[PDB]
Subunit: 334 residues, 3 copies
């Protein structure tokens, strides 16, 4: 029975970090308790000062990543404070029944609820807010994240050999649909409700105005680049709740990749570009071998460089001339 | 020789049903005979009354699904009645040679033809009408369906263990390109020929006006939802002859999925979202475990909720609190 | 050490051909030397006379395909003649470090450089020109190609049995973004620099004006169709450096396909349509069984027939009535 089974409480951390946790483990199943608080807020999303009337789980885009093990039970308390204006709920793609939990978590401002479901399938799974009649608006406005359910004995390769990561990072990619006025400038709205009609009309064209990692253009560059060092293995979790994307690590590879995101399937090796289907999360492992700066981006280069879907990873260590060597620097042509 | 081999005659049924048939079987190869009649017709495709100058195999979008077994021969009589205005033909992606049969089935109104080909490869395969110089118009106007070629010993999992379905359903997804007039309202045309030029211009923008399952917005909801019960396995066949889509069962999963649609390959398990490439059909199995209402949709949520790509499945039975439990209903925040 | 190891010099040939080479081989690793010269040029890209201010590796779109074996070292001399106006560089997705080599190959007009990297992973990999601040423009203007790294013992099927091709062909697919003037006609530019601003604005809409194989509408049809004969196996290499595409051989199949393009993974069999992610190259094998004309195209049929993404293959030999037979030619309906 899930009733008896020890309970545990997890504290969440802001993306792109993922909360400390175990890969392989000797512990038996548990009821893992989490809490999240919805926050509607206006956010600045680019270098020219454009804003989005946004909606978030826990104040961030994307929401925090939740980690449990196969066979555990997830038990979430979802809170919607009186300071918000809309109702919300939650749908876990990793769960079975009731539209992922949406039908049992409908919360008006000033209310809360508690849902439990069994995490009986391994992989990275999207969760979203899906209120009847406003599903796409809430999702494109920022209300998505990932639940990672790891196998009890850790990750495995196609032959059943063990795989591991030394660090984990989580990246949410958001296609945004910001309206413009007759002067061709983007519109700035006083409340969340007033942005609605105009936004639906942009959505229907299927052309995003911006496509961003973790809330804004440049969120993962400069002081905020991801970091690693030569010899370390990183797990890159990538979610896209509404639209397809194609991650690529410029200067590196996907060593082992589950593009559909489900760990009971064998991963593919040596990828240059992988593919995340809209409405899913995927995962890639890579072991660094050269120091320097890498670009982790959506490899439709217009979507990356013009629209915003690109970040940086800064890697420390020693250069490997066997792997790569500048034989003759740029010089005049004889 | 295919000449000698018993012949059999199959009677087709309207989507979303699939005609009775056997999975595993002791019968040897046969020549399976089918007939289809082309029907051009104006159809209502949404809740505001918009119409499409449509073209169909057998009066439906999509055409009926044809089922045979690996090693059988398909023998189709294609009829184009004098009441139609355009010529047509057929291209089976499951066949080898002559552009899938198009070059041997060109039929003007008042004519018919008969084609035979060997179904030597297992999977779900699209068929379409492809007349020289008008290929995309006929396809986007409704002329596509699926041929399912099952392995003689039935479906198998990656380890070679047997899989089965208790029911089958077939869903065709159609990206439509309906023109608008200077007043911004959709155009209504007196004949099929007059819709042509305007439609080509919308097509070239790559933005559909509507995206629908089985002919229209809401075709698979309300009195027309699909049905199942807890403990039953369903096979969901999904075709898209022109554009990519990403099926997802909200509240459930793809237990075993062949996203490229070819049964000699091992399927993937536990998927949240799968991917059907434009110009192919794919297949997913799922065993229900909770009763209620599920949404089966394209998980670009704008394409699903705003443009039309979504249906419903109504499932009867007993609720499972181990799988999912509402711990604390929505209530005021302490 | 890579220093000692015999060197060899390869001479490149224009697409769609691939330079003679060995599949399985008894030779040990080598340092394989290549040279490429960048050429900016105005090109005619359609049947109405539209031009593109283009940028190429070696005068062609796509660039030539380079072939080495796993464990070899690639050593490229990249030359940028004084007659060009822009700087350029190179990023090999098959390489490790320094943004694929871009950071060590920045060459202004009148300069050259030489890069070496170890090809330690099997598959077809895209290479591109990626200058800081102008990455998407150079790529969409024509600066991409494929490096094929074959396994030392040749290609293998999922069970480890040997596979081979008798011929190879290489196809690059280019999404183009040509601006229009107030009269709705496409613009013709005097220099490469003057096309820039207008092109960026079209790019940002994500709607290509044209989508072409190997530089232009019809590049692979008529006198320029690909060729084969019944009983022969062909390898079709397909690259798309910026946008997703879905190859399909009308009248045939993908017998064995590596859609992500990495040969250490098992291929899928019997495909009708496969999928090349933007920023990657993929590969398919097919053995012809019927003579005639086939269409090799992108199976979004609008992108193929209206925008340009389609070619032809002309196959000689004897017709097979077991595989396909016209039973009753088109005739009046009784
Ligand atoms: Cu919400
Ligand atoms: Cu969902
Ligand atoms: Cu037709
Ligand atoms: Cu086709
Ligand atoms: Cu360049
Ligand atoms: Cu790249
Ligand atoms: Zn490690
Ligand atoms: Zn059953
Ligand atoms: Zn051969």
């Amino acid at each position: 029975d899930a009733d008896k089974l020890p309970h545990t409480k997890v504290t969440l951390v802001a993306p792109p970090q993922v909360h400390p946790h175990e890969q392989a483990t000797k512990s038996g199943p548990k009821v893992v308790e989490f809490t999240m608080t919805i926050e509607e807020k206006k956010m600045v999303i680019d270098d020219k000062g454009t804003t989005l009337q946004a909606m978030t789980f826990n104040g961030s885009m994307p929401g925090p990543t939740l980690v449990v093990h196969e066979g555990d039970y997830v038990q979430l308390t979802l809170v919607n404070p009186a300071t918000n204006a809309m109702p919300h709920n939650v749908d876990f793609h990793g769960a079975t029944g009731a539209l992922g939990g949406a039908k049992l978590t409908n919360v008006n401002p000033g209310e809360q609820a508690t849902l439990r479901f069994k995490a009986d399938r391994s992989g990275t799974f999207v969760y979203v807010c899906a209120p009847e009649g406003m599903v796409p608006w809430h999702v494109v406005s920022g209300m998505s994240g990932t639940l990672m359910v790891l196998p009890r004995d850790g990750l495995k390769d196609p032959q059943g050999k063990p795989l591991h990561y030394d660090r984990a990072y989580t990246i949410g990619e958001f296609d945004l649909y910001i309206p413009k006025g007759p002067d061709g400038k983007y519109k700035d709205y006083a409340t969340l409700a007033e942005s609605y009609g105009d936004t639906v009309q942009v959505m229907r064209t299927l052309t995003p105005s911006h496509i961003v990692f973790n809330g804004k253009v440049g969120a993962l560059t400069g002081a905020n680049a991801l970091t690693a060092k030569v010899g370390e293995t990183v797990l890159l979790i990538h979610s896209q709740a509404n639209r397809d994307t194609r991650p690529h690590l410029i200067g590196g590879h996907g060593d082992w990749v589950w593009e559909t995101g489900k760990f009971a399937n064998p991963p593919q090796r040596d990828l240059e570009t992988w593919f995340i289907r809209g409405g899913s999360a995927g995962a890639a492992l890579y072991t660094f071998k050269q120091p320097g700066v890498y670009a982790y981006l959506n490899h439709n280069l217009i979507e990356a460089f013009e629209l915003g879907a690109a970040g940086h990873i800064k890697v420390e260590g020693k250069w490997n001339d066997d792997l790569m060597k500048q034989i003759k620097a740029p010089a005049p042509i004889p």
